Amino acid sequence: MRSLFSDHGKYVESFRRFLNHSTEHQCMQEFMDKKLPGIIGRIGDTKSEIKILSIGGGAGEIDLQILSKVQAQYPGVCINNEVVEPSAEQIAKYKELVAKISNLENVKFAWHKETSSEYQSRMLEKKELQKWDFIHMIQMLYYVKDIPATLKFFHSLLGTNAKMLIIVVSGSSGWDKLWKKYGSRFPQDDLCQYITSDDLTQMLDNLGLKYECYDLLSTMDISDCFIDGNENGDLLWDFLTETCNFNATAPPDLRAELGKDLQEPEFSAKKEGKVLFNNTLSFIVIEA
Numbered sequence: 498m499r500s501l502f503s504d505h506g507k508y509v510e511s512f513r514r515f516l517n518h519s520t521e522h523q524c525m526q527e528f529m530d531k532k533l534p535g536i537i538g539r540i541g542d543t544k545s546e547i548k549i550l551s552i553g554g555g556a557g558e559i560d561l562q563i564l565s566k567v568q569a570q571y572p573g574v575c576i577n578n579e580v581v582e583p584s585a586e587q588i589a590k591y592k593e594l595v596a597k598i599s600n601l602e603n604v605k606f607a608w609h610k611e612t613s614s615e616y617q618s619r620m621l622e623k624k625e626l627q628k629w630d631f632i633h634m635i636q637m638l639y640y641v642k643d644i645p646a647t648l649k650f651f652h653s654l655l656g657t658n659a660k661m662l663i664i665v666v667s668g669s670s671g672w673d674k675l676w677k678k679y680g681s682r683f684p685q686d687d688l689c690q691y692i693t694s695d696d697l698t699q700m701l702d703n704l705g706l707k708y709e710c711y712d713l714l715s716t717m718d719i720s721d722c723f724i725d726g727n728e729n730g731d732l733l734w735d736f737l738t739e740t741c742n743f744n745a746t747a748p749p750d751l752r753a754e755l756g757k758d759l760q761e762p763e764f765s766a767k768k769e770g771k772v773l774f775n776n777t778l779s780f781i782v783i784e785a
């Protein structure tokens with residue numbers, strides 16, 4: 498069995514089928530409108546420049562929804578938004594999106610093609626240590642080698658009244674149970690790491706940092722996954738298992754239990770017509 502992360506193309510398509518069959522984006526957007534305003538309420542106070550650091554260029558459109566909310570609280574204030582993203586393809590796509598929006602004059606972007614870790618070292622090199630008013634790591638800790646050291650480092654870049662927002666799947670979600678029971682049976686990638694809000698809150702408690710945790714229900718429609726042969730129904734299998742051609746490349750004994758289990762309640766909820774997997778998300782906000 499070859500992990501899904503080893504076939505950039507298969508990944509993408511599978512990843513797209515994920516968004517297209519789930520409330521993933523709507524959920525984050527619900528957060529940006531009903532909660533962010535309150536959170537980023539004073540990160541601009543007394544400053545003639547607002548510095549935003551996004552560790553991850555995959556959510557270009559969320560990065561933008563963020564600015565929107567920040568620009569609304571501080572009319573006229575110039576905003577410096579830096580992005581740390583390893584993938585040239587991601588930065589590229591991000592740039593297209595930026596150029597296609599009419600109205601952002603109070604914003605200056607800068608991209609850095611590197612990893613949160615490479616960026617960290619490079620900075621620890623320069624004598625001076627810059628500060629930020631708002632930092633956010635949306636769904637990318639999975640890809641971080643040393644979490645505790647990352648959490649501590651970026652927290653230390655927080656200026657006055659600054660805040661760091663982190664988003665990962667909730668510890669009370671399908672993902673959790675799924676990983677806890679079958680993870681040890683999927684292709685364990687050197688680069689990926691199954692992580693939920695529980696791991697995070699333990700890590701932050703030990704680190705001694707002060708935070709607040711918000712969970713919002715989100716669901717993934719996995720019905721196509723029960724009609725054997727289905728084209729889409731399998732794209733999602735590949736995503737849930739992050740494994741290339743799950744069906745046609747894995748132990749029948751295994752696919753059997755999952756079939757039974759994905760329909761289980763602690764994994765999904767059966768609603769009118771559809772079977773929804775628990776995609777509950779966690780929003781962690783850390784005070785400087």
Ligand SMILES: Nc1c2c(nc3ccccc13)CCCC2
Nearest residue numbers: 521555635636637639666672776
């Ligand atoms: N919902 C997501 C999951 C993973 N990566 C993601 C990366 C982008 C934002 C949504 C994601 C990896 C494992 C499980 C879930």
